[PDB]
Amino acid sequence: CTRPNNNTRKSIRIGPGQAFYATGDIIGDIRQAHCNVSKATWNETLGKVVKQL
């Protein structure tokens, strides 16, 4: 699974003393985060599960 966003952390000193980490800017490969699954592997294992069922 991947989140292709080289984003920054514009931390803001909303004290007193204590600090808050806000979201800076979002740059890079602006794509939606997603997961990669080996399809044949899933199909194969799922089948093995169905056998039990």
Next chain:
Amino acid sequence: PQLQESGPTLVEASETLSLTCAVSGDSTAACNSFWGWVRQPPGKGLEWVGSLSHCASYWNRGWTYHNPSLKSRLTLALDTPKNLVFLKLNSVTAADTATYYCARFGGEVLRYTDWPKPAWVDLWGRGTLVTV
């Protein structure tokens, strides 16, 4: 924002050419642009040499874009604490005589889709004529 070409003006046939651009007014290490070169032959038009950036993604250690016809003899480099751009052109022939320009590249760089797409010379140098 100021670019400045530097290096030898005369090299020997088959010798590697090493040119360096002094960048002032901005930081080359910043993700806003690509850095590279263009070499206009005397009495002819512009020719893109190449460009690169150290603004890396999870799968690499930055981005490098070569001219497929020149790749076979070309290495590029950057110096982020001094802000320098390097041209390492291998085995230089008479056909390689040209006015070389330090180029900052604008385009769909900073935010991009699938891979960075720079498309124009954001900032120009003045040019240097290198011969053999």
Next chain:
Amino acid sequence: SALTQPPSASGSPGQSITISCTGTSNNFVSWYQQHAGKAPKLVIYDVNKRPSGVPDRFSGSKSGNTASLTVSGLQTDDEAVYYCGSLVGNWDVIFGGGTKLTV
């Protein structure tokens, strides 16, 4: 694949010239201005966009396989060699032959 530009342009001051660039696009289209003994200057990018300082009388467009740049209200300083530029395939930066314009 490469960009094509006719070798040269002409009209009197106060006139307007539209210059073509054949080799399609893409929104990744730009034009440059070069004077003799001078480095090229970026005139326009993203077809329609002028960077800070470029006069309001400079403007391009595109259709099909050809892009264009129109320079209106010609004067002495407008005489220069102009180049169009396009991003091709993956990252290939192409320059046209260049069109030398005279007022």
Next chain:
Amino acid sequence: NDSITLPCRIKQIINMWQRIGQAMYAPPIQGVIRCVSNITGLILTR
């Protein structure tokens, strides 16, 4: 390949273990985030 792409969303305000009455703010993590793991079972209902 073949392979499957699963669309995901990111949240910063979350509630643990179905517990209401409190919530925790995740700080944004700087840079590109990517990881890999082993799926070792299913929670299925009939």
